Amino acid sequence: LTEDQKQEVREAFDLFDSDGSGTIDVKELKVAMRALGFEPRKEEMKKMISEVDKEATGKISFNDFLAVMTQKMAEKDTKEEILKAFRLFDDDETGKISFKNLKRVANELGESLTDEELQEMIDEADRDGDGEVNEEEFLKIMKKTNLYHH
C-alpha cells in the first residue's frame, strides 16, 4: 500500500483521461507512468496489461492504475535498499563483490559462516563465472532472498 502518493496517482490519472470517462488506454498508461517518473519496460509491460485486463477492451480503470503504480514505487524502494546493501559489501568499490569482500563484512557483523559457506554464496550469485558478484547479479539473488524474509 502507498500512503500520501495515491493523491498524486489520482492527479496523473485525471490529467491523461481526456474524456473524463474514468478509463485510460494502453497508450495513455505509458505516458501517465512517465509523468510519475517511471520508464515503463517493454517486457514488464506485456505482463502488466494482461494482469489488469483479461478481456479485449483495452481499458484501464483507476484501481488498475493504482495497482501497477504501487508495485512500481515498491520496486523502486526495494532496488534502492538492495543497492544500499550492495555498497556495504563492495567497500573497496570495484563494482563487484569478491569472496574477500563478503568474508570481511561477515567477520565484522559476527556471522557464523565458514569460508566454504561464503564461497557457495558467491558461486550461486555469480551467473557469468568471473568469481565475483556484480550489480545485476546481486539484484537477482536479493529478490530470491526476499521471499524467505517476509
DSSP, collapsed to helix, strand or coil, labels residue 60 as strand
Q: Does 130 bind Ca ion (CB under 5 A)?
A: yes
CB of 130 vs Ca ion, minimal distance in Å: 5
Is 21 annotated in a binding site? The answer is yes
Positive or negative: CA dihedral 39, 44, 50, 56: positive
Q: Does 90 bind Ca ion (CB under 5 A)?
A: yes
Number of residues that bind Ca ion (CB under 5 A): 14
SS3 percent helix, strand, coil of the chain, rounded to 5, is: 60, 5, 35
C-alpha cell at 88: 556495504
Binding residues vs Ca ion (CB under 5 A): 17, 19, 21, 23, 53, 64, 90, 92, 94, 98, 101, 126, 128, 130
Q: Which residues are annotated as a binding site?
A: 17, 19, 21, 23, 28, 126, 128, 130, 132, 137
